[PDB]
């Protein structure tokens, strides 16, 4: 009862701190997912920029 509450709140605090660091692990997963997302979108930005920039170059020369 009393000792239930004491030891169970202890296990609560331990696994709550550890599972919020696991939430920080999930947040680093989301962080790197945003990193890959911005690398995807910005590399596609550079790709469309360079491709249609060279297309303007080619239409200019023609």
């Amino acid at each position: 009862s009393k000792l239930e509450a004491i030891l169970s709140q202890e296990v609560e605090a331990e696994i709550q701190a550890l599972l919020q660091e696991a939430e920080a692990k999930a947040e680093a997963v989301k962080r790197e997912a945003e990193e890959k997302a911005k690398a995807l979108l910005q590399a596609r930005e550079r790709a469309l920029e360079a491709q249609y920039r060279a297309a303007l170059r080619r239409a200019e020369s023609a």
């Binding site: 080619r58 239409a59 020369s61 023609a62």
Partner: protein, 119 residues
């Protein structure tokens, strides 16, 4: 033979395994030993519309030189002649070049005189 100097700059030709491992300097005459059925005319068209000097890679001389591709095809299949007309006029890289072409059915003495004309 006293009136020439040695070649000392380079050229890029787009091809990576030419630009890095066996460089084309300006003055060099390097032949492409093709096979029989290999693409040689495709590499011809690619080097023709992708070669560019890089004076920015130098100590920044002038761009007062333009570049000029003199392209002399002698004894071609005429399928390849259609390939060269479209692969030159396609990207607009015909405007810095001059194409001395002759087919296979054209007489043999033009296939003699063609590289004299181009050089």
């Amino acid at each position: 033979p006293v009136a020439r100097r040695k070649p000392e700059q380079f050229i890029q030709t787009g091809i990576s395994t030419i630009d890095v491992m066996n460089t084309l300097v300006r003055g060099q005459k390097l032949p492409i030993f093709s096979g029989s059925g290999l693409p040689a005319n495709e590499i011809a068209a690619q080097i023709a519309r992708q070669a560019t000097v890089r004076p920015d890679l130098s100590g920044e001389g002038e761009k007062e030189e333009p570049f000029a591709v003199v392209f002399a095809a002698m004894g071609i299949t005429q399928r390849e002649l259609s390939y060269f007309i479209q692969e030159f006029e396609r990207t607009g890289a015909l405007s810095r070049s001059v194409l001395f072409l002759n087919k296979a059915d054209d007489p043999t003495i033009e296939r003699i005189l063609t590289p004299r004309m181009a050089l």
